[PDB]
């Protein structure tokens, strides 16, 4: 299936493209990238994708403007054509959510 | 629901569109037009329509070139962005299937010949034999034309004298 | 189209005027009656 | 059917798009954004939307380039091609008493 | 797999398109159709066909 | 990549050149291995890689760029607060700086 994992400060997203059944992987800058540009980047990788959208776990469709960081905070359904790979590997370390804590871990 | 009914002898597809839920109808000449046009026409009628693909009664989908009449021969599911409208066109084949078959047998059996022995290639040669025959005479005329251009000029130069 | 079915936005002009219909502007209904080739089994007997 | 909620201090509209009967949820920047650019987004999720506008109850058209926070702080009519939903925007929660002070240090550090 | 069979005087070819794992079929008029135009009908059917040859 | 997965059409070159990578032509797979020169301690790279994302989350867990744009917007209004108070004082000074100038051009003459 599809999985996302962080490498060199950025998340790589190793989707499975339909044509050739390849497994392409995108590095996408979570600050200056909206799903509006990660999707268009997903199509132009292999145009054989009729429709491609992103669903928050409750069927509600994610926008075409939310920044990936905003999306990567939780899991989400990534649907290409009929198939619906729902990624839940974003490995959010949001255990504490404590800005005072993480900062302390940062400075550590 | 959607359905196609014939009018004037043409098929009128009474589709329902997703965005503007209101029965829009399409006309399409069962000869000149092809699904690659009607579909793309329906593709432009509405906008929210993003991915439409006309399907055979089973999983097989039709191309973007099949002629409409070749399609309308039987039922076919038409798929809009998120729904499978299940068209049932009016049965209008009007030919015994076996007879339809034995004619279908003929049609291919003819063309098979028409390309087994490069018949198309022979027509061009026939014409290319006609050109040279014309170009055989037309050049053979060029000698006689000169003397007749002169004679005509002379005999005309004389008749304009008497005319004067 | 006379049945209130909105005709396509890209149907053939001739096919439009080939029959009655009701052109409309913002409110009006200019009901217009202009004046006056599917393959068939009858025709196929002729090719044979 | 239209709802405005808050995720990570950001408003998240939940429209009911026509062309798929599918709910798309934008997020809005209550400062940078504007109904002039928010509408433009609401188009790009379903081009089937042609006559779309938005306005306060009495004010029959909140003009483009209006600060989203202006629109946000009060209910408004959201007009899609024919359906005009009236939103119930939530009254922002007030925690800016003193945490903001010690937070405005955190923020300007991170 | 791919198979071609004649229907109504023309051959229909039920190729297996890569995307959608779909099985499309083409009615191609074999008098005035080069492969140069049957292939376009493949690609423009589903652009995911990167290269296609015979 | 060294294995089957395909590098996207947006990965930065340096982000790719970190390791070997098969490059494929129309019918061939040229097997490329660029020279490895980062030389940053791998585990240390990780504990830095941890930091980068760890900040990244903090940057958007609390909508910073929403607050930066707020801070700037707070500056505008303050400028637009003073530039308001100036408008009264400007006129009465535009007046005098005309009058007291209308005299100094007289004495100049």
Swiss-Prot record, chain D:
Subcellular location: Mitochondrion inner membrane
Signal peptide stretch: none
Modification type S-glutathionyl cysteine: residues: 24
Factors inducing expression: MCU transcripts are down-regulated by microRNA miR-25. Down-regulation by miR-25 may protect cardiomyocytes against oxidative damage in cardiomyocytes.
Effect of residue 24 to A: Abolished glutathionylation in response to reactive oxygen species
Domain of life of the organism encoding this protein: Eukaryota
Membrane-side (Mitochondrial matrix) residue stretches: 1-110
PTM sites of type Phosphoserine: 19
N-terminal MCU domain: annotated span: 2-92
PTM text: Phosphorylation by CaMK2 in heart leads to increased MCU current. The regulation of MCU by CaMK2 is however subject to discussion: another group was unable to reproduce these results. Phosphorylated on tyrosines by PTK2B/PYK2, promoting oligomerization.
Function description: Channel-forming and calcium-conducting subunit of the mitochondrial inner membrane calcium uniporter complex (uniplex), which mediates calcium uptake into the mitochondrial matrix. MCU channel activity is regulated by the calcium-sensor subunits of the uniplex MICU1 and MICU2 (or MICU3). Mitochondrial calcium homeostasis plays key roles in cellular physiology and regulates ATP production, cytoplasmic calcium signals and activation of cell death pathways. Involved in buffering the amplitude of systolic calcium rises in cardiomyocytes.
Domain notes: The selectivity filter, in which calcium ions are arranged in single file, is composed of two acidic rings separated by one helical turn along the central axis of the channel pore.
Family that this chain belongs to: Belongs to the MCU (TC 1.A.77) family.
Subunit details: Homotetramer. Component of the uniplex complex, composed of MCU, EMRE/SMDT1, MICU1 and MICU2 (or MICU3) in a 4:4:1:1 stoichiometry. Interacts with CCDC109B/MCUB; this inhibits channel activity. Interacts with MCUR1. Interactions with MICU1 and MCUR1 are mutually exclusive. Interacts with SLC25A23.
Protein name (Swiss-Prot/TrEMBL): Calcium uniporter protein, mitochondrial
Organism: Homo sapiens
Full-protein positions shown: 74 to 183 of 351
From Swiss-Prot, chain E:
Modified residues (S-glutathionyl cysteine): 24
Induction conditions: MCU transcripts are down-regulated by microRNA miR-25. Down-regulation by miR-25 may protect cardiomyocytes against oxidative damage in cardiomyocytes.
Post-translational modification, as annotated: Phosphorylation by CaMK2 in heart leads to increased MCU current. The regulation of MCU by CaMK2 is however subject to discussion: another group was unable to reproduce these results. Phosphorylated on tyrosines by PTK2B/PYK2, promoting oligomerization.
Localization terms from the record: Mitochondrion inner membrane
Residues that bear Phosphoserine: 19
Consequence when changing residue 50 to R: No effect on calcium uptake in presence of high concentrations of calcium. Abolished dimerization of MCU
Function per UniProt: Channel-forming and calcium-conducting subunit of the mitochondrial inner membrane calcium uniporter complex (uniplex), which mediates calcium uptake into the mitochondrial matrix. MCU channel activity is regulated by the calcium-sensor subunits of the uniplex MICU1 and MICU2 (or MICU3). Mitochondrial calcium homeostasis plays key roles in cellular physiology and regulates ATP production, cytoplasmic calcium signals and activation of cell death pathways. Involved in buffering the amplitude of systolic calcium rises in cardiomyocytes.
Domain notes: The selectivity filter, in which calcium ions are arranged in single file, is composed of two acidic rings separated by one helical turn along the central axis of the channel pore.
Family the UniProt entry places it in: Belongs to the MCU (TC 1.A.77) family.
Subunit structure: Homotetramer. Component of the uniplex complex, composed of MCU, EMRE/SMDT1, MICU1 and MICU2 (or MICU3) in a 4:4:1:1 stoichiometry. Interacts with CCDC109B/MCUB; this inhibits channel activity. Interacts with MCUR1. Interactions with MICU1 and MCUR1 are mutually exclusive. Interacts with SLC25A23.
Protein name per its UniProtKB record: Calcium uniporter protein, mitochondrial
Name of the gene: MCU
Covered range of the whole protein: 74 to 127 of 351
């Amino acid at each position: 299936d599809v999985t996302v994992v962080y490498q060199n400060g950025l998340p790589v997203i190793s989707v499975r493209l339909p044509s050739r059944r390849e497994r392409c992987q995108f590095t996408l800058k979570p600050i200056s990238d909206s799903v509006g540009v990660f999707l268009r980047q997903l199509q132009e990788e292999d145009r054989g994708i009729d429709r491609v959208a992103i669903y928050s776990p409750d069927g509600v469709r994610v926008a075409a403007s939310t920044g990936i960081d905003l999306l990567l905070l939780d899991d989400f359904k990534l649907v290409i054509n009929d198939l619906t790979y729902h990624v839940r590997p974003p490995k959010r370390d949001l255990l504490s959510h404590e800005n005072a804590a993480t900062l302390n871990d940062v400075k550590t | 629901d959607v359905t196609v009914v014939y009018q004037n002898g043409l098929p009128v597809i009474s589709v329902r569109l997703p965005s503007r839920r209101e029965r829009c109808q399409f006309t399409l000449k069962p000869i000149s037009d092809s699904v690659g046009v009607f579909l793309r026409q329906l593709q432009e009628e509405d906008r929210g329509i993003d991915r439409v693909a006309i399907y055979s009664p089973d999983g097989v989908r039709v191309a973007a070139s099949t002629g409409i009449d070749l399609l309308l021969l039987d039922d076919f599911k038409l798929v809009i962005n998120d729904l499978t409208y299940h068209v049932r066109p009016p049965k209008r084949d009007l030919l015994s299937h076996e007879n339809a078959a034995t004619l279908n047998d003929v049609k291919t059996l003819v063309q098979q010949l028409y390309t087994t022995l490069c018949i198309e290639q022979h027509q061009l040669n026939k014409e290319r034999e006609l050109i040279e025959r014309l170009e055989d005479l037309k050049e053979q005329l060029a000698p006689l034309e000169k003397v007749r251009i002169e004679i005509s000029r002379k005999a005309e130069k004389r008749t304009t004298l008497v005319l004067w």
